[PDB]
Amino acid sequence: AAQKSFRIKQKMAKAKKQNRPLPQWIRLRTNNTIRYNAKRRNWRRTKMNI
Amino acid sequence: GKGTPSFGKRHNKSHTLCNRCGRRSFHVQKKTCSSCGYPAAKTRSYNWGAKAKRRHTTGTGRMRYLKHVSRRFKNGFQTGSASK
Amino acid sequence: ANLRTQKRLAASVVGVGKRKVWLDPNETSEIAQANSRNAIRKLVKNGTIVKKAVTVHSKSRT
Amino acid sequence: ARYGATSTNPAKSASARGSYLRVSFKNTRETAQAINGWELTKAQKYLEQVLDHQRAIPFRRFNSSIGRTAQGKEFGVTKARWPAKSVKFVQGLLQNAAANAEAKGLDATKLYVSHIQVNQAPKQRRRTYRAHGRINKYESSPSHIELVVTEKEE
Amino acid sequence: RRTITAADRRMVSGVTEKQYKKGMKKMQQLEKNAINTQIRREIKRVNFQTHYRDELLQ
RNA sequence: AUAUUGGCGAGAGACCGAUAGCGAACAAGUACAGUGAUGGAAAGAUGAAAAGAACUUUGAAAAGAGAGUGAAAAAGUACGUGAAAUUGUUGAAAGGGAAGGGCAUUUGAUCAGACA
RNA sequence: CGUGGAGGUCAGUGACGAAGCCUAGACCGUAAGGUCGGGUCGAACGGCCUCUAGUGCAGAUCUUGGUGGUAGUAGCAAAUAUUCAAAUGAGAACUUUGAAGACUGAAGUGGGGAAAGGUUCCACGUCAACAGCAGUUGGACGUGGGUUAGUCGAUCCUAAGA
């Protein structure tokens, strides 16, 4: 919440830096099977249970 | 109501994060994690949870040290300078 | 264009609320470059923005 | 670009196509079937009357439970409607076909619309939330549209 | 007193702007295809209630 | 001497061949659900080579039609072939409160065989 | 009769097109089924004597996946209420501004906060998807910025209790 801990904040920071798309230059590699980011998460759909 | 209302009174956790497995299992009124008794020295595991004994057992992680022992045994646990 | 944030800043500056604020409709182009709050201060004294008057609640019949 | 069965030559005929369009298959089909075999000038004049609510579009197959009207009589039927998204998405391919023709060198005074067909496309899917804690689909019926014009000869 | 943007950062690393657009579109599309599939493949046994009471006896 | 569905390294099979075979051929004990114990998936193939459609034109834009690459776009990243249900267009035919079927023949369509 | 694989054999067919697939086109067989032509397609496949099985589906409120008719139908009807002009834009019942009308009516549709959520805050750009109509708008999408404590709180004390 607002009056939170640090463990929680640190995990939220991680989840923030994870909440980006896939860099387009990944898709140009020579043997690539990665079209998009499937571990994507947003506060509306899926809550992270910490 | 036993349903759609009484899901509304759900805003205080009976669980939070264990410092040894890192998942929301640490019961806090009693202080024991439900997937690895944390204050306890032994990790919770039962031979009816044979799936659970794959999600946590050896090989799951990095194996920082243990990945190298078959490499070290093969060479005879040698030591010292590499070579010329 | 879209002067919602300008209307917000104007209330915040003047003191009054979002509903006693008047932005000139003939000056949208000049209000839109008020991306800041120090510009609103220029506009309030140029008269492009106005602090409308309190609606009246008389007490004479009382 | 493989098109359907056109019994007409490719030299004296131009083409157009729209794919994965978010308009209703059923109402676009009846729209197209209302202009098959026609002249372009008397089709674009008609689809614009539709949107002005004159000269309706007859619903012949996908016509159950809809209502009756008086602009069906020039087609015989009594059930008709005025679908103004089907219309727009068709009217925007007639323009394309006319252009393709005018750049191929075909005279736009005798062009008629020979082949036109609407298909079903993949559904684009959602959820609606029904009673007693259940779910049911709420999805679109997109349409592929495919169009051909050709100039009338002897 | 500024030089840098993400656009100038991604210019050197391959994709330009029109390829960023053309990549985003197909990326989004392949993200939406799987959603259409997941809804289809869940829709049967999403409405399957373990303890539905059926408020009807008489 | 014996044991060994675990670990490390090797060799093989009258085995399965992507709804199979490990739950997992792929960023799988992943995503996701649940307070929690626990539960637990789906999803492989462009082509030899991206040569992944320069350029022209209509369009607000997607996109389209021309062009072009290719051995092949009836391989255009929704890409191997691409079945069926289901559906559109065209063509033929029939059709008074069902349809379909069996015997027999007319009419129409198609095939036959030269017996040169 | 037929299917997956095995041992022999036809010094078997084949990129000059194998297998597969469509074919109210043909032949054989009582029949299971086999053969041929055409179109499609692109790399392996068959006949015969034998071996061997995870070997043949119309069904199981069968399993998984997919698709239909009903159906452009039921229906998107609580919460007093919207309207005019302009600007923007491809496009405006729904965006922005202005004017009007009205509501909450201070036990509020206001102003803050605890749990909880976790960046939803703010800006710039943007509309394929979401907003069960629309959308130039957005708690959406993309990129980024952003939370400053000797005095507020935790920290310290102890309660029920562990």
Next chain:
RNA sequence: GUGAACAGCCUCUAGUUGAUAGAAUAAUGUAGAUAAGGGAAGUCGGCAAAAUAGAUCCGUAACUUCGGGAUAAGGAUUGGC
């Protein structure tokens, strides 16, 4: 402000003006009202609805654990200047 009243009704500060819309006004409906004469005959049953309703003055029974019953019942008044 009314009023006993943080009730209800109207309004100022502040906030919103959001809920898919347009046209038409058929049956049957949901919600809200009215009704001649009679007045519960309806109906299992006065279910539903209606009537009464506030304040002031008068007057208030049986029974009673003597505390109540009791706003008993039952009447009149109410504005403005």
Next chain:
RNA sequence: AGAACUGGUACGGACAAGGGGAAUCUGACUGUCUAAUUAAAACAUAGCAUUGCGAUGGUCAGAAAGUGAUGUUGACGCAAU
């Protein structure tokens, strides 16, 4: 509190706002429960009575213990009906 005057006899003018009475069955009352078909005469209640127990104890617990609840207690108490 009172008096005049006055009005289409209207006036708690909208809002707000008790229907009343005679009797029977039952439970004393206030209260509680069947979250999502039963709110009731059932449960509880105070009040009355009974039973055990003087601590080496009554009732109860625990796998067991240098173990425990009543018990920071002591018959005007604790426990069981």
Next chain:
RNA sequence: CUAUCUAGCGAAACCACAGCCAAGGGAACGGGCUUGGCAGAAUCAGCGGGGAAAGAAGACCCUGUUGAGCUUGACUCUAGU
């Protein structure tokens, strides 16, 4: 306010094939069979006779050498004392 017509959006239950009747016989109450009556595209709003309409491998009854909750002086045992 809906229903109704229109722009847009747009599901579900259910479904052997299906959908005009009478009598007959029949698993004893046919949409289909047999004999007759009859029969003309496509259809809109309503309706609630029917489709022994849909929902739910009857819940009552019975059988099972299937069980469970509960009681007791049932059989066999047991903590404790």
